[PDB]
Symmetry: none
Subunit: 165 residues, 10 copies
């Protein structure tokens, strides 16, 4: 598994609050990060998962947790989806475009016969170590609350090593 391994370098374009920015692993150093992968923009299914996370963004930003959603679509596709869907409109975190598939492959999360990323979520600590991984098939939603619980538990463990039980 990738559990307990260090994320790999990357450099991608992203759409964040009306602006196009460049994101690299440098931007994640010293921070808690959530890499939220999904297959494709503009599909016919409502983006509730991406919306759930947007609903907890403020609380996540309070926890010092940056959020990066990722699909193999471009940041141009992301900008357009943001201004055409009420749910995606709520998104304030960075929406990374990964058309080369490199970020997705770094996380071993590519459906090679589709060129689309699987529904996986990765929690990465300040040293770049993956502490939690969640992957689900279509239809099985990822609960943003449970994600919050894990990130809080992970942050605790980092501050209280040796959770005596």
């Amino acid at each position: 598994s990738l559990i307990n391994t260090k994320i790999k370098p990357f450099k991608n374009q992203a759409f964040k609050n009306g602006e196009f920015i460049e994101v690299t692993e440098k931007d994640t150093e010293g921070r808690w990060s959530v890499f939220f992968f999904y297959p494709a923009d503009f599909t016919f299914v409502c983006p509730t998962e991406l919306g759930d996370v947007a609903d907890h963004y403020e609380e996540l930003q309070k926890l010092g947790v940056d959020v990066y959603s990722v699909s193999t679509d471009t940041h141009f596709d992301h900008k357009a989806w943001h201004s055409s869907s009420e749910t995606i409109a709520k998104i304030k975190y960075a929406m990374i475009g990964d058309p080369t598939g490199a970020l997705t492959r770094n996380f071993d999360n590519m459906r090679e016969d589709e060129g689309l990323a699987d529904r996986a979520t990765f929690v990465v600590d300040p040293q770049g170590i993956i502490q939690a991984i969640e992957v689900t098939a279509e239809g099985i939603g990822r609960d943003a609350s449970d994600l919050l619980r894990k990130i809080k538990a992970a942050q605790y463990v980092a501050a209280h090593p040796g959770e005596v039980c």
Copy 2:
């Protein structure tokens, strides 16, 4: 990741309710399965992840879901752990022993430098397809409630394809 792939064949010994049985993939066919991996028997750590799943074992069974916990310890170690801890005593589902690590590796869940499996839960459908994967570092904890919600969502989706919110 292994999401959406078919589980690989396996043959392991296990301890289930005072008995030693053999478990293979044939045992999972036609059924929903949860494979619950943990690092080591007799560990000072809160056997909290194993007990909570034992608690919801009633519901799971109502839903036609079989449960298998797995560690690189042997079934003999499982039997002994079962009759030495009250928390582990509640377990009525099979406790698989994976000393060769083949089951753990089939699910790409081995901590190679420790010879112990990582804390991971897998949901497998009746056709052997992995529908949900969860892996966490020590101390983070897997919520058996969120698991139940996922299983029911997986079952719902298998019965009613295409009934998700329209954009």
Copy 3:
């Protein structure tokens, strides 16, 4: 080089006049085909290259020529772009999505460090033979009228060998 070579097999989803369909090389057998690749949907560059081919579409259908535009975006992105841009809404031909990049790599037309296809147009005959190729860097536009000319000429040649 690809000139005078046969196109490779492919299977991709596309958006065509309101519907999602599957397109494969078998759909080109016995027909004249134009594969029009471009970089990305929704960019700030003038959608003029795609819209102009659309203007000449009815005429191309009259000559028995099918048109397929291709980008590494999905057919979902294409549908969205088609209903949000007026120039793209004019498109009645198939907009192929190539997220795996296989169709693009078949025509050796991928910018590997971007994951986007280069601006290239290919003219393919009924036997699957590429008779014309045009590739341009960004900012240099492809002329639909010149494409039309080359297509009519390709057809003449086919019907009147040597001259």
Copy 4:
């Protein structure tokens, strides 16, 4: 593709306005270049494609654009063809001979079964980068006027980068 790649070093003999010269990639550096390949000298083929580029040469020169025609024939063959054909005689640009096939292969444009180059045109910028490619089958025809439009467009873009759509 070769699109957006830098041309490769080369050294060939060429016929240009009565004299024999030697062309290398050094001559193209810092200039806009058009490499116009064709199959063979002395062919029934309506030399209309080469003669038409000649018709735009004066304007091309005025824009800083050199032109080189290339065939796998020798520069000797080019001299001869240039004196026996009225269309070819209108040519004032260099006529490169590529009998080793090297130049043609650098541009991946050899018909390996015939030993002749395919009908292709390449626009190369001052830094050696290919900005436009065009290849056509026998009898289809390249439009010198469209070539001109492409060149102006490329020159325009080199000067005004990131020209968004108004």
Copy 5:
């Protein structure tokens, strides 16, 4: 075989008299060692091979010989076994846990299709040299007396080279 080669470096956790310690090759330097490998803790089999060695542990210690039993179970499993069986309770020497199987493999003693070590005893001298090797199938049994005789012969031979019967 490994006869006459130097043991390889290793780092394992162990259980020794109610404590968890770390054992490495540095621990064996300058000492005589017996590495006693067995297949699995909590096994119904006569813990007879492990108890007899515990009995002669007194003499061995008189001779400056350290003892280490090893199985692919963890130290946690060893602790539990130690406080659940009277026979295993007699053990006062280190019980090494080898879940990664690296120690077992260093001594080329792994049953690969079981993930369990074979019944093997190794005698290692102060310089790390393997002087005696014994491996037996299940049911055959290793005699701790013959072991003692070998160790004393190995010690005698190290102190008095060349004093063997003349032909």
Copy 6:
């Protein structure tokens, strides 16, 4: 290890009671066998180990156990050692000559830098499976009695599978 593995084919010349015979794995099928390796004939150390075994030969033959001693010396060397040493003279079992080293390598028992076999003893059952292995450095003798005990225990286990304890 070689424990629980099947012996490999071999074909060697041997010296047995005044005669030269050929031994192959065929001769071991259906029988219990002991392969007793030693480094070299005619050395200056008394062959007590080979003699101990000769002392128990009769009892071993009663148990249906064939004995084959082995060194990389020839059967010619063996014949000569037999008629020149009182201890080796007592030997009635076959003394295999292995100058090619093939039998010794089959049992992974060659000291490659010496061309001599190590002091190893292998107990093989009727199906050709190795059930016991004993290897010792020079000076540490192999006790023929303990060998008898193991062979008897191994023969028991074969007749009473599942030694309930």
Copy 7:
């Protein structure tokens, strides 16, 4: 050396006084053939090597010998040269064009650096065997006469096998 080996198959377009034809190894089968290679058409070098062969063409055709000139130029280039040079217009044999260079390479006669064949002459018997080779650097000429003497003697040995001395 290719001396005494059999020519390799080939198919080339050629110009034979007025029209375009295709020459193959078949055209040579059961016939004496002379392959005359030269570097390039329309060259400032006096075609004395090509025209001098033409002169002996009548005598050659009588002996049952065909002539093929060969250069890496095309047959189109050949027709043009045959109409702009008196020396060349004298040619009645086939002028083979070899732009792929396969014919030249079949005879290992290519100046890989220039993509032009060297000045070489070959004599091939009816069975396709090369009986005489001649190569010269630009300047040293190839004797028309000598070529004839060679062919004559070559043909003698043809009917009268080795005439010992």
Copy 8:
């Protein structure tokens, strides 16, 4: 073709009228050299190819040209033949023996099947460049005269670089 390439280094024993010498590429440096190859000594074939070269030897030595005959026989074989054949005794140039076949192979002139060189003649300028090659099958002869004409013309181009037409 080896035409226009530089000869390769070589060291061979040779017989030059009466004595044994060693020839090297050095002996050729700054000198016009002619390498005359033939299949074998003491052959039933009339040495008209070797003796006829001898005749023009005086004229050749005048032009500053050396002659080396070459066969895969040894120099010992050469001395013997030079004393049992009038035609051969006429030879005053060096008769190189090439039993290893390196000299012949340097000139790609070996009949690998017979281990004998082919009937070939080479002209090498002072800079070591081969200017003329000639190979013939047994029967077709090599013209002494022609060889001379070649050398003469070859030397003209030497001082008077390319004399355009």
Copy 9:
């Protein structure tokens, strides 16, 4: 070694009593053979080694033993040497020429730096098996009489297998 190995197929031209013949491994089958290699024909070297084998040829023939001398020289060179030397002229056995070096290499006896075979003698039995080998440096000398003793011994052993020591 080559000792106890079967000779390899071969085909060479040889000079034998005035005529040119062709020898192949077929001729050695069912016979006892001696392959006597030497460096070169016409050498100052005292032809004493070859002449001495000649001296025993009559007896060798009487025992069913053919002899073949081999050098990398041609069979032509052998004819000549045979007529100009009184020692060589005493030879009635085949003189094989091995200019390709093949035969010599089959017996792994080529001095690769000289293109000449080393001074070696091989005794080959009716089944093609090499029973005796002898190689010596220049100037050491092979004894034809010892060769004879070896051959008789080999013939004796082929007839009386396993001749223990009385």
Copy 10:
């Protein structure tokens, strides 16, 4: 082939006139050496080849020539054979044991399917160059007198180059 090649380095134990010694190539440097290989100790074949070399031993020592017999048996087997056979007891030169077969393989003289060396003799000069080789199948004996002759001749040649 090995003729005119230099012997390879080796290190082996031997029995020599009552003692066990170590022999290496360094012991041959600057001396004339005879390596006499044979199959096996204690066989039923007549020990005549070894005993005859022994008869010529004093003379060989007089010429500055060392003799080493070699078999794949150990030096222990050699000692035993030397004290049990009268023909072998005559041996005063070194009897090398080659159980690893390395010395034998150096001289490419091993019968791989038997693990015994072939009957071969090599004459080595002070510079380690093999000047003479003789190999024979079983039953065909090697003559010590002829060996002596070749050795004296090898020496002449060394002292009088060309003649």
